[PDB]
Enzyme design. Sequence first.
Site, mmCIF file in Angstrom:
data_model
loop_
_atom_site.group_PDB
_atom_site.id
_atom_site.type_symbol
_atom_site.label_atom_id
_atom_site.label_comp_id
_atom_site.label_asym_id
_atom_site.label_seq_id
_atom_site.Cartn_x
_atom_site.Cartn_y
_atom_site.Cartn_z
ATOM 1 N N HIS A 1 0.807 -1.222 0.000
ATOM 2 C CA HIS A 1 0.000 0.000 0.000
ATOM 3 C C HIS A 1 0.837 1.268 0.000
ATOM 4 C CE1 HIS A 1 0.357 1.129 4.268
ATOM 5 N NE2 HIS A 1 -0.045 -0.067 4.652
ATOM 6 N N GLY B 1 3.054 5.812 10.220
ATOM 7 C CA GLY B 1 4.435 5.646 9.823
ATOM 8 C C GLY B 1 5.079 4.365 10.291
ATOM 9 N N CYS C 1 4.059 1.327 9.552
ATOM 10 C CA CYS C 1 3.861 0.231 8.605
ATOM 11 C C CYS C 1 5.197 -0.280 8.091
ATOM 12 C CB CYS C 1 2.976 0.686 7.440
ATOM 13 S SG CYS C 1 1.254 0.872 7.917
#
Lengths: 301, 305
Positions: free
Chosen positions: A41, A143, A145
Amino acid sequence: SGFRKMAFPSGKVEGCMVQVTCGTTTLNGLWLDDVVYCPRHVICTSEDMLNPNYEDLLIRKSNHNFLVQAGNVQLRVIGHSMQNCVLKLKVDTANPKTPKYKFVRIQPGQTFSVLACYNGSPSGVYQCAMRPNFTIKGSFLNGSCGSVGFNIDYDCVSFCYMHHMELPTGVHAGTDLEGNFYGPFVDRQTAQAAGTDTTITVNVLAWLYAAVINGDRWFLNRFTTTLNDFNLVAMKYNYEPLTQDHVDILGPLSAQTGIAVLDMCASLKELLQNGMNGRTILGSALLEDEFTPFDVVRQCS
Amino acid sequence: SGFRKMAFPSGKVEGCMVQVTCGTTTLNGLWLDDVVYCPRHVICTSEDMLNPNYEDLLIRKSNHNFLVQAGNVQLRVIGHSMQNCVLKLKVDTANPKTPKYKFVRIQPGQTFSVLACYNGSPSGVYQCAMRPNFTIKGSFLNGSCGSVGFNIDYDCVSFCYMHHMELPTGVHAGTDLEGNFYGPFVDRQTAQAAGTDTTITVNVLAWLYAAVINGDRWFLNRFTTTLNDFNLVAMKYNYEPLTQDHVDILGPLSAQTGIAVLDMCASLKELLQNGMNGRTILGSALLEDEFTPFDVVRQCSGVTF
Ligand SMILES: *C(=O)[C@H](C[C@@H]1CCNC1=O)NC(=O)[C@H](CC1CCCCC1)NC(=O)c1cc2ccccc2[nH]1
Ligand SMILES: *C(=O)[C@H](C[C@@H]1CCNC1=O)NC(=O)[C@H](CC1CCCCC1)NC(=O)c1cc2ccccc2[nH]1
């Protein structure tokens, strides 16, 4: 003596974290040999959050659209491909700090350490468990991820989780390092709800054994139960069924303490019925379910 | 969101741990520059646990009596000296993995991460607090002595604790890296007991702020208190007194949540006098006191190292 929620030392994983930017999105990547793994993503824009066609989005990207930074050094992307929900960025240099590692997909109830990172740098390390409903109860901000979960039995790092998203109820969902989500979730910002959370029965029992090993006996009783009667009671408290596999797995702790597995189940049944009456077990006033039988044996010996 | 008991990343410390063996005993050492630090009780034998004069036993020992191994490489000891209860072994080569570091002495109520090690090999990491009675509630087995506790600030490792012993109640005692014990303990085989412990009030308050930041708000109320009034309740419940410095340090969290400290103190007073009535806060059924105000700030803002 003592019992703590203990994580694995994080150094072998710290040396693998990098920052990946695409467009205006920055998250973390995992640099092993000459590949950087990160959530796919990272290629979404603000109009692609609900129904992204990732194959269509990725084909439009050039290698130079991906900015990868390790410390104060940019790595040159020389190729990219998608595997399920993870993106694999080929870079021109192998990570000299790559440890011995493997990818493992875990089952609900298994525990692992999380190295929470922002902008490619570590914030802290903590233990987590894969809940029966395939979520984890993490501590993750925007942030985070691309932060990973891992175990280090021996000197081999087993990567088992990569962080993707936070559900509306405040728990977290992600994939293995082959890009397959744990549980029924998808990488879309569409309405998604986890199943009802249940308690990991075999882990509670393991932790009661840990308490006995550390000298505590106040919760034991003189009763036993059949496995089927135990499950009829425990399910009324939203506990997971205890299987014969689980009973077998607790054999070692049972042998060390001299308390038969079904006798400990009778103790657990009474605790569910009575609560703790102002007492604690291993410093907790609730029944802990995030220690596995394997964890207890590692820590207590 | 979410809130977990989070340790510092340990990579900077892992590269400093070595194994130290003297006679029959093996434990861990910390290798920084060209010195390995470890507990001086490594030199004791079975007939010296009772009452040892280490300064006399250290003269009898020679350099080659200390086997230091870093991984599978043996470090050559070229000198030895004692500083309080810590032995300093000078080795012939500087640790190329030495991080930027300093030795600091912490105060009760401060938290730090412990890197538990065995045979010079790091085994696990967890967050501790220095209790008001100067013990720590650790998890340590035979062979863990010389494991160290640390904090990280930016790129700087502050080493604050070295492990020496377990007390009869199962809690743990050690020294700073200049070898001064925390608390009224000695490194002799003798009867020793922890003092009665108390709860770290400023840390409970910080954790209640963490709870509100994460949307857990049932315990807030309309009331406020004074320091004197609160402190009288604290004393009654074996809580550490709350000072004006503590109020100041919580300042950030108060402004961020709109819950003034003495306002949150009124919440905590009610929790003490009435308990939790079967409810939980941040997944706990007890009042947690091992998060400092700074701990909460950096977890809730994502501070990195
Ligand atoms: C990546 O760094 C973040 C990590 C999140 C931020 C808050 N805590 C976390 O764990 N991930 C996201 O922000 C995802 C991004 C999506 C992009 C498109 C494909 C699906 C993932 N979004 C969320 O986690 C998100 C949005 C949202 C809106 C409302 C409630 C919850 C919620 N979670
Ligand atoms: C060092 O590795 C160990 C760490 C201990 C082992 C069990 N848990 C720990 O944290 N330290 C010791 O074994 C010390 C050694 C002593 C030598 C003489 C000088 C003082 C330290 N001993 C103990 O920690 C010890 C002995 C003992 C006897 C009875 C009750 C408790 C107890 N603790």
